[PDB]
Design a protein around this nucleic acid. Structure first.
Ligand SMILES: Nc1nc2c(ncn2[C@@H]2O[C@@H](COP(=O)(O)OP(=O)(O)OP(=O)(O)OP(=O)(O)OC[C@H]3O[C@@H](n4cnc5c(N)ncnc54)[C@H](O)[C@@H]3O)[C@H](O)[C@@H]2O)c(=O)[nH]1
Ligand SMILES: C[C@H](CCC(=O)NCCC[N+](C)(C)C[C@H](O)CS(=O)(=O)O)[C@H]1CC[C@H]2[C@@H]3[C@H](O)C[C@@H]4C[C@H](O)CC[C@]4(C)[C@H]3C[C@H](O)[C@]12C
Ligand SMILES: [Mg+2]
Ligand SMILES: [Mg+2]
Ligand SMILES: [Zn+2]
Ligand SMILES: [Zn+2]
Lengths: 1362, 96, 338, 48
DNA sequence: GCATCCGTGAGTCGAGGAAGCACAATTTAACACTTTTGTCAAG
DNA sequence: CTTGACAAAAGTGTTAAATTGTGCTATACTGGGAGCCGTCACGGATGC
């Protein structure tokens, strides 16, 4: 069968014993000399199976013939050794031990069921306070003892063994109270010591005995080794023994008849007891417990009158009943187990339902939590008493191996040590119980057993972590194995090490195609080793596979035909290149390997930006897909030439880069001269003749008669591009000169470089007209123009022609950057003549400010602010001067060309190289008053360098502490939206979102058109929900909005015809466990409608998390994004109006108050004094509209306006941060993540359902329950929308596997085990953990069952069937 | 590690990239056939050296270790089928 | 509460220390109770162990988990005895109670003894509990007639129990007590020689100093045995992202190459055996274990085919020679021999 | 703090002997350290 | 409504590997002797 | 195809030597030692 669901539930002791093949009774692991496992040990062959396949311990059966047989001599079953990895054991605990996962995991589930606090549960479990299970008529301090009452050690001893005290008398003094007399509290016993409790007083050690002979008060002295054997006031006849001693020589006897009197006791024992004299034999014995009315002695004549412990004193021959109660009080996990057994879940559920109606909110919340736990136990079918372990399971020994390394040393895991400690403590407890150890020792050993069980289950959670003696390293328990970044889930389940994988340093390959990479010969031989062996076997290179492998083992034994065979193997196959970190989905790309001589991987330049890979020492990994499915997926979906557009924004990602852009811009830029630059003539011949006279330059802009042209456009008229480029080759004209060409029947006035670029595009796309329509010939080719050209080529031609154009552009750009002559010199950083003047003006203004400050016209703070403003203005002016100097005097300056073309550098860096470094910041954040007036070309001073080092180190630390946060946020986004897949073509929903085209600017307080980039990010590749009529164009419902449609909508908005665009979005998608094709829109990586089965959730998470590193960190930047995704309450939260109305300001010196007034309601908000109010008197504010500048609390906005408003606010605020950094990200991803955030609701009115008020569930589930209740006429469940962060939403998912593998593994696992949650394997993480086919991509049910058949076989089937 | 002649770590982020591409079969191979499916990897190697296609992969050993450790934590982890009947992924080797 | 040792010390601090007189009376009561149990067993004829267990269960009360019904029956039988025997029953009960009190009141002594044995592979509380076991044994064997205080006799048993527990439970791989003593003596001798010579001694000097019957080889083997196993989870590196288990290959399960070559060898052998006759191939498979069973002897195969041993040997040799001829003429099976 | 010596070149060992680490036993930790310890204080002039 | 203790989390690769002593109960190396073949002559 | 003689290979039955495990030391000892520390933010109960 096929695994479809995974169920986790509590394991009963009977089930645990059923799992085990035998009880592990000894802690011995292996023998030290023979190295064989010891019998009944942690590694016993009799329990966990044989060490080697088909071989018993006794060495009698050694073959597969006796398969499934258990040897009679040794007991080891004759089977495969691999069962050693799968056969478990069990340890039968002498006393029950509570599972720590159900004790210290707040809220304590056992405590929740028993209504016991964490402290009380810890005290009871770890033997600190007793708990009563049967009072047995016990009265404490005048209050009868009730059940479930906690008793300390003193209280338990008082109730169980009675009250007793010992007062030690000083030597020599005689007690004032006779032996066997009742005394009251405060009564003096001896002259130096007084009693503290009422009871019978007894002599402990009489030091002197005073016998009164009758014929003589003879006295005898008693020593510690002598014991009196007669009572006080007893008649002793001559010869009777009086005092017994070790030596009969010193034994004291009576000479004649007398009366024995005891005197001088060592101490007095006062016990709260009743004394009964007796004459005949007693019916009871010492240690028993009696009740009033019970017979004690004399055959019923003497009857007990009070509960207590009975003890017979033969010396005084009386029966003492100490007043005590046979109270049943216990500690440890046995009492907890008994209490959980006694619970009736039905009665508890009924009581909790009754209590749920209490008006108190805290009472209702507590009842809801307890009732949720009870309902989980009831529905799961588990028993509460299963939470306390009676038999501890034992992991198979191969999962905790004791291996022998090649060096002879033994390596073992910490689980062996934990099991050894547990077994030792259990056996010691068994021995102590068998030996009748006292209560203290037994209690201590039971506490040790409980602590050992806790350490085995989860080490370090409670108390000091258990460490191996001789070191302070905590032992690795099962919880530590299964939790954390180094746990099983994140290290061996979600990610694994793979075979057929290599790694090497990458180098740039310009000669490679976009779909090719340079795989080294040795790496290809090692990675394709099995295929190479098969190919060598096919040919005559080797006789068989073994000979081929032996040949390949030695480097000098490899012939020359092996390389030819390897080349034959890799024909058609592709390999996956990977570079860590894989920030987005293009970090792994399929390339067609090309064998190269060397050891470094050759990487195509164009994909480098996709890989975020430079060639300063990067390393990349190579993986080899094996089967036909993997090869088809790599060649069709994962191919580098097939992923030309970025899925995040839809713009091209494999586009011309630094050197390519530099070369194309250099050739496509025209020359501007200044020789003539204005001279006007009458006829063109005059201008030409002046040109040969040298008065005017070739490219100098002149006027011939009325029009403005140049000498080049008149002197050089080329009939076709071939003649122009032939003249360029001969050196008559340059690529940067402006001449007249006849292209496509049009007399253009352009440069031969631009005509050459047009020809390049035409030859690359093999279509002159389309290529002409794609390019813009009137501007130099910068990065943006090349990107637009690539996108237009992708739209008009397809992937293959776009890849060909990309390769041609790369080749030509590289060649022209090589031959153009771009170089960086110290004089290329031109110092403007205006910098000195600006610095002098700044110095004069600073001197004026200082003089004014000395005059007292301004204070320190505003003087510092003015200095900062002055220096910022000076820096901006210097930047403008630098760029004006470049664009006027040196238009082809390498720094200017690189900055303008976008190949490298930004205006700030060009300023630092050419202008001034500027202001710098202190480590505390303040900026230095004096700036760094010297640039890098002039050279900084030591002090200026030290000042700049502060900012440099701050930026480095910011990047270091920001990369981890960005990665963790990306992990959260992946784990919360891992289940989102395109699962159907259309869900049929009628809801939508109105994307606004106008933003309400507050400085003008009016609607202004948003930026084109924002509208494109919010509308490109989206399905129109409603038909839109703009500019005579009717976009029907269900039409995908392309870039042309977005531009048309933008133009219509500019014409004032449309205010907002209604589009279908994932927020309004009704598809369960995913989205629909018509709601997602285009697949931005292909500029076509999304294919059904794509994992859009993972794509969205990666797209959002990739530019997290680029966001500035320094409520702004990446922390703002994090607090937005987590729905955290901002510290400087804004104040919003809960209800709509007219605003009224009551600003007073005492307090600041804002009133929202309505027809019958009036709300008051007490604002802080330093609040930047953005609303004035006489304004109409709506519900949720902010009143103070700041960050809106998402929960307050959701509760004030509604789910749509809070979703829109979240999307807009998240997108604002990316806009501020220049990163273009489509709103689909943010909307998907927000939809995942808004997936949960809270029940307010249970209605006709079993749900509880305040319970949090999924919106889809409650909607289904509501429609089901409506179908058969029942009161619907009232629910309130709930917003939670990505962490809380991911942790509360229905599938326990993904939640456990994400975070809080212990809590998720314990909740799932208690509730018996069954994982349906809906998302992608669970299938990854189980290694199944994920329900996305080729594994989606929509396309998984597609069948391909030829014509002939299909016709045969039809003919043979019909 | 190169010194120990080990493979390349295919961590979580690479799995996310494969899921984003939708390469379900490649991801399954890299999780089972090429990593820890003992019978699966042995059969795949035998098929490749024989010129045949690799067989369908099976349950990884890592999931078996997960199940056994969860059982050692006294948690009953059971894998079910469409009809909710228990499914033995250990091929009867752990059944008494 | 958080510190188990603190809680245990607080618990043992609630039992006042025994004076000399109290110690003597408790020891005398224990001796008298043992003698009374002996007399009761002699008279009633019951097992002394059974009577002692019944008396101990009655003394400890019902707060303890043989079924209690037989304990009650035995107690009723003992109480049915006349007064001269109920006297011994009461003496036994008082002796058991005194034994419990005496054991309870000497926990400070065992704590003080065990505080000097810490750091030898066992935790403090484990040493305390093993010393408690030794203390119980000492109370069982203590005699007050010799007039020696209880501490003097109890210390021997407590330290003996602690040392035995350290020898038997401080190592993951258990080593017998005699070998533990040998290792300890070897370590002491090595340390003494090391401090005497001012350098680490070689095995020859250690063996010479140990005594007769010891050589360098035996010292080396003893040191090799005394090597504690190394943990598989010891981190290596500044970051806590590596462990020993990540560098130890698994050499038990066959590698994919090994399984592949085994399958290839099986297929080639099956193809080669096709050239043999039907009977010869079956005989060779039976004689070489190709039927997954142990190689059947000549007599077993002969009885299976109803043939004598000599003919089976002859046909097996002839078939082996034919296979050798085929291999020589083909050479398609030599590479698998290695 | 006892690190395996880096002696690729004499300058390597010379720098390694003159390194100052805020980590180690009793010191800070890689992921327990904020911006306060990682910044260049004004007193680092001429000393670090 | 708020101060406070507790628990959980904080990027990816790679390259870093301190007694002895006596005495009885259990195991096993060393042999000695039948038992069982593996093979060889006899055709 | 069979019918007897040989020459080891393995198993059975003692034999003590080696190894292993439990019992016993009688002046008097009567409550532990190591920590110990530079982080922030966010649930979430725990009380006042
Ligand atoms: C004393 O510290 P070390 O450890 O000795 O440091 P290095 O030896 O100087 O580092 P390196 O790697 O050899 O070279 P480099 O830093 O000049 O860049 C080499 C390239 O690897 C990559 N890369 C570097 N660190 C990385 C990281 N943490 N995660 C992921 N990728 C990383 C980058 O793509 C670098 O561009
Ligand atoms: C238009 C012309 C053929 C005209 C015809 O068919 N008659 C085709 C045929 C072969 C083409 C060149 C090669 O591909 C190599 C190289 C590929 C780069 O991508 C772009 C540059 C190169 C030099 C190409 C330029 C151009 O595209 C050529 C000359
Ligand atoms: Mg780099
Ligand atoms: Mg001309
Ligand atoms: Zn066996
Ligand atoms: Zn939809």
């Amino acid at each position: 069968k096929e695994v479809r669901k995974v169920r986790i539930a509590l394991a009963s002791p009977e089930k645990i014993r059923s799992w085990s093949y035998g009880e592990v009774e000894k802690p011995e692991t292996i023998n030290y000399r023979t190295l064989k496992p010891e019998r009944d040990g942690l590694f016993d062959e009799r329990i966990f199976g044989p060490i080697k396949d088909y071989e018993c311990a006794c060495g009698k059966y050694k073959r597969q013939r006796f398969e499934g047989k258990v040897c009679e001599r040794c007991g080891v079953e004759v089977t495969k050794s691999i069962v050693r990895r799968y056969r478990m054991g069990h340890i039968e605990l002498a006393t029950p031990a509570a599972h720590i996962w159900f004790v210290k995991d707040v809220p304590s589930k056992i405590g929740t069921l028993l209504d016991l606090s964490a402290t009380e549960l810890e005290q009871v479990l770890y033997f600190s306070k007793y708990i009563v299970l049967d009072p047995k008529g016990a009265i404490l301090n005048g209050v009868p003892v009730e059940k479930r009452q906690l008793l300390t050690d003193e209280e338990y001893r008082e109730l169980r063994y009675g009250k007793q005290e010992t007062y030690p008398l000083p030597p020599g003094v005689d007690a004032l109270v006779k032996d066997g007399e009742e005394v009251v509290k405060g009564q003096e016993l001896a002259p130096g010591v007084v009693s503290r409790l009422d009871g019978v007083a007894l002599y402990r050690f009489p030091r002197r005995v005073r016998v009164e002979y009758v014929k003589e008060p003879k006295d005898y002295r008693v020593q510690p080794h002598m014991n009196v054997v007669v009572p006080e006031g007893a008649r002793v006849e001559a010869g009777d023994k009086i005092v017994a001693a070790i030596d009969p020589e010193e034994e004291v006897i009576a000479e004649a008849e007398g009366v024995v009197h005891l005197h001088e006791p060592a101490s007095i024992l006062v016990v709260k007891a009743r004394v009964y004299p007796f004459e005949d034999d007693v019916e009871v014995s010492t240690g028993d417990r009696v009740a009033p009315g019970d017979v004690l002695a004399d055959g019923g004549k003497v009857k007990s009158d009070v509960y207590g412990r009975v003890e017979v004193d033969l010396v005084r021959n009386v029966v003492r009943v100490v007043e005590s109660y046979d109270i049943d009080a216990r500690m440890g996990a046995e009492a907890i187990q008994q209490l959980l057994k006694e619970l009736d879940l039905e009665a508890l559920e009924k009581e909790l339902l009754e209590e749920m109606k209490h008006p108190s909110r805290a009472r209702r919340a507590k009842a809801r939590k307890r009732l949720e736990v009870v309902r989980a136990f009831l529905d799961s079918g588990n028993r509460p008493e299963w939470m306390i372990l009676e038999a501890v399971p034992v992991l198979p020994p191969d999962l905790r191996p004791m291996v022998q390394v090649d060096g002879g040393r033994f390596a073992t895991s910490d689980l062996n040590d934990l099991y050894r400690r547990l077994i030792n403590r259990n056996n010691r407890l068994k021995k102590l119980l068998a030996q009748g150890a006292p209560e203290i020792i037994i209690r201590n050993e039971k506490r040790m057993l409980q602590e050992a069980v806790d350490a085995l289950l989860d080490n370090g959670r409670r108390g000091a972590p258990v460490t191996n003696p001789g070191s302070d390293r905590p032992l690795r328990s099962l919880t530590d194995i299964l939790s954390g970044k180094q746990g099983r889930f994140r290290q061996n389940l979600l990610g694994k090490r793979v075979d057929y994988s290599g790694r090497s340093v990458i180098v740039v390959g310009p000669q490679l195609k976009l779909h090719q990479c340079g795989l080294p010969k040795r790496m290809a031989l090692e990675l394709f080793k099995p295929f190479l062996l098969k190919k060598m076997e096919e040919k005559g290179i080797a006789p068989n596979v073994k000979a081929a492998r032996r040949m390949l083992e030695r480097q000098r034994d490899i012939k020359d035909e092996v390389w030819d065979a390897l080349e034959e193997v890799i024909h058609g196959k592709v390999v996956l290149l990977n570079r860590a970190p894989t920030l987005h989905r293009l970090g792994i790309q399929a390339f067609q390997p090309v064998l190269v001589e060397g050891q470094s991987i050759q990487l195509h330049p164009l994909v480098c930006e996709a890989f975020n890979a430079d060639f300063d020492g990067d390393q990349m990994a190579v993986h080899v897909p094996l089967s036909s499915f993997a090869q088809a997926e790599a060649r069709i979906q994962m191919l580098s030439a097939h992923n030309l557009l970025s899925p995040a924004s839809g713009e091209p990602l494999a586009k011309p880069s630094r050197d390519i852009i530099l070369g194309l811009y250099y050739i496509t830029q025209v020359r501007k001269e200044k020789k003539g630059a204005g001279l006007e003539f009458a006829t063109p011949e005059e201008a030409l003749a002046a040109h040969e006279r040298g008065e005017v330059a070739l490219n100098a802009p002149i006027k011939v008669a009325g029009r403005e042209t140049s000498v080049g456009r008149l002197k050089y008229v080329f009939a076709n591009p071939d003649e122009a480029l032939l003249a360029v080759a001969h050196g008559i004209v340059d690529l940067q000169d402006v001449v007249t060409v006849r292209y496509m029947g049009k007399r253009l006035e352009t440069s031969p470089g631009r005509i050459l670029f047009a020809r390049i595009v035409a030859e690359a796309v093999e279509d002159e007209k389309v290529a002409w329509e794609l390019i813009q010939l009137d501007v130099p080719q910068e990065k943006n123009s090349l990107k637009d050209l690539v996108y237009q080529a992708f739209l008009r031609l397809g992937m293959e022609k776009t890849a060909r154009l990309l390769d041609a552009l790369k080749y030509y750009g590289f060649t022209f950057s090589t031959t153009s002559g771009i170089t960086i010199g110290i004089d290329d950083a031109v110092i403007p003549e205006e910098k000195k003047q600006y610095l002098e003006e700044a110095d004069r203004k600073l001197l004026q400010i200082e003089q004014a400050y000395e005059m007292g016209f301004l204070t320190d703070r505003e003087r510092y602010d003015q200095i900062l403003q002055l220096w910022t203005e000076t820096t901006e002016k210097v930047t403008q001067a630098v760029f004006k100097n470049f664009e006027e005097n040196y238009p082809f300056n390498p720094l200017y060309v690189m900055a303008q073309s976008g190949a490298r550098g930004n205006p700030q860096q060009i300023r630092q190289l050419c202008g001034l470094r500027g202001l710098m910041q202190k480590p505390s954040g303040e900026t230095f008053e004096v700036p760094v007036r010297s640039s890098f070309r002039e050279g900084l001073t030591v002090l200026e360098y030290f000042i700049s080092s502060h900012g440099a180190r701050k930026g480095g630390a910011d990047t270091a502490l920001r990369t981890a946060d960005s990665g963790y946020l990306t992990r959260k986004l992946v784990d919360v939206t891992h289940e989102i897949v395109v699962r159907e073509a259309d869900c049929g929903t009628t809801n939508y979102i109105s994307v606004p085209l106008f933003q309400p600017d507050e400085v003008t307080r009016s609607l202004r058109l948003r930026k084109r980039a924002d509208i494109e990010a919010g509308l490109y590749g989206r399905v129109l929900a409603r038909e839109v009529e703009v500019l005579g164009v009717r976009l029907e419902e269900g039409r995908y909005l392309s870039m042309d449609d977005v531009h048309l909508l933008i133009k219509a908005a500019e014409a004032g015809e449309i205010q907002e665009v209604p589009v279908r979005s994932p927020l309004t998608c009704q598809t369960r466990y995913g989205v629909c094709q018509k709601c997602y829109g285009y697949d931005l990586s292909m500029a076509r409608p999304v294919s059904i089965g794509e994992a859009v959730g993972i794509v969205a998470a990666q797209s959002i998390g990739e530019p997290g590193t680029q966001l500035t960190m320094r409520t702004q930047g990446l922390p703002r994004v994090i607090e937005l995704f987590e729905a955290r309450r901002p510290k400087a939260k804004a104040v919003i109006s809960e209800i709509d109305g007219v605003v009224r300001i009551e600003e007073t010196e005492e307090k600041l108050s804002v009133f929202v007034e309505s027809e019958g309601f009036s709300k008051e908000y007490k604002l802080p004094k330093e609040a930047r109010l953005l609303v004035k008197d006489g304004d109409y504010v709506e519900a949720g509209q902010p009143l103070t500048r700041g960050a809106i609390d998402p929960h307050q906005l959701l509760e004030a306006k509604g789910p749509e408003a809070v979703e829109r606010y979240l999307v807009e605020e998240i997108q604002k941060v990316y806009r501020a950094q220049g990163v273009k990200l489509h709103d689909k991803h943010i909307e998907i993540v927000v939809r995942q955030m808004m997936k949960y609701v809270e029940v307010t009115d249970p209605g006709d359902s079993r749900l509880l008020e305040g319970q949090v569930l999924e919106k889809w589930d409650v909607e289904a329950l509501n429609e089901r209740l409506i179908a058969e006429g029942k009161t619907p469940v009232a629910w309130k929308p709930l917003l939670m962060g990505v962490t809380k939403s991911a942790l509360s998912t229905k599938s326990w596997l993904s939640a456990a593998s994400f975070q809080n593994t212990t809590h998720v696992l314990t909740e799932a085990a208690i509730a018996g949650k069954k994982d349906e394997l809906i998302g992608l993480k669970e299938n990854v953990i189980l290694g199944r086919l994920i329900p996305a991509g080729t594994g989606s049910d929509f396309v998984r069952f597609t069948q391909v058949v030829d014509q002939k076989t299909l016709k045969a089937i039809e003919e043979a069937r019909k | 590690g190169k010194a120990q002649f080990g493979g390349q770590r295919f961590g979580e982020m690479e799995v996310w990239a494969l899921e984003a591409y939708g390469a379900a079969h490649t991801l399954q191979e890299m999780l089972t056939l090429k990593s820890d499916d003992i019978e699966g990897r042995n059969a795949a190697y035998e098929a490749i050296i024989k010129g045949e296609d690799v067989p369908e992969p099976s349950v990884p050993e890592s999931f078996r270790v997960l199940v056994k450790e969860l059982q050692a934590l006294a948690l009953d982890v059971q894998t079910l089928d469409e009809k909710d009947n228990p499914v033995d992924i250990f091929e009867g080797l752990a059944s008494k | 509460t958080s510190d188990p040792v603190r809680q245990y010390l607080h618990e043992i601090g609630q039992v006042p220390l025994l004076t000399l007189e109290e110690e003597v009376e408790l020891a005398r009561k224990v001796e008298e109770g043992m003698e009374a149990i002996k007399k009761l067993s002699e008279i009633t004829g019951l097992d002394p162990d059974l009577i002692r267990e019944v008396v101990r269960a009655k003394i400890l009360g019902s707060a303890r988990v043989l079924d209690p019904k037989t304990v009650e029956e035995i107690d009723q039988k003992l109480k049915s005895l006349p007064k001269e025997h109920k006297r011994y029953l009461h003496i036994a009960r008082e002796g058991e109670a005194a034994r419990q009190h005496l054991i309870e009141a000497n926990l400070r002594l065992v704590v003080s003894i065990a505080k000097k044995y810490t750091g030898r592979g066992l935790s403090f509380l484990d040493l305390i509990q093993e010393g408690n076991q030794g203390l119980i044994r000492a109370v069982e064997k203590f005699e007050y007639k010799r007039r020696f205080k209880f501490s003097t006799y109890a210390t021997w048993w407590i330290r003996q129990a602690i040392n035995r527990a350290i020898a038997d439970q401080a190592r993951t791989i258990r080593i017998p007590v005699h070998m533990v003593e040998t290792i300890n003596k070897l370590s002491r001798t090595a340390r003494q020689l090391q401090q005497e010579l001012g350098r680490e001694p070689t095995y020859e000097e250690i063996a010479e100093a140990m005594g007769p019957g010891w050589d360098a080889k035996r010292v080396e083997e003893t040191l090799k045995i005394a090597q504690e196993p190394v943990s598989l989870e010891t981190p290596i590196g500044d970051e806590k992202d590596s462990f020993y288990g990540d560098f130890i290959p698994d050499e038990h399960l066959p590698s994919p190459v090994d399984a592949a070559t085994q399958s290839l060898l099986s297929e080639e052998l099956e193809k080669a055996l096709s050239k043999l006759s039907e009977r010869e191939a079956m005989v060779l498979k039976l004689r070489k274990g190709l039927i997954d069973g142990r190689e059947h002897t000549l007599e077993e195969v002969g009885a299976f085919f109803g043939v004598t041993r000599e003919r089976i040997r002859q046909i097996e040799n002839k078939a082996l020679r034919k296979l050798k001829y085929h291999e020589s003429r083909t050479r398609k099976l030599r590479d698998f021999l290695d | 703090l006892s690190q395996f010596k880096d002696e690729t070149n004499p300058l390597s060992s010379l720098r390694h002997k003159r390194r100052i680490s805020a980590l180690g036993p009793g010191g800070l930790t890689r992921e327990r350290a904020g911006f306060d310890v990682r910044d260049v204080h004004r007193t680092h002039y001429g000393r670090i």
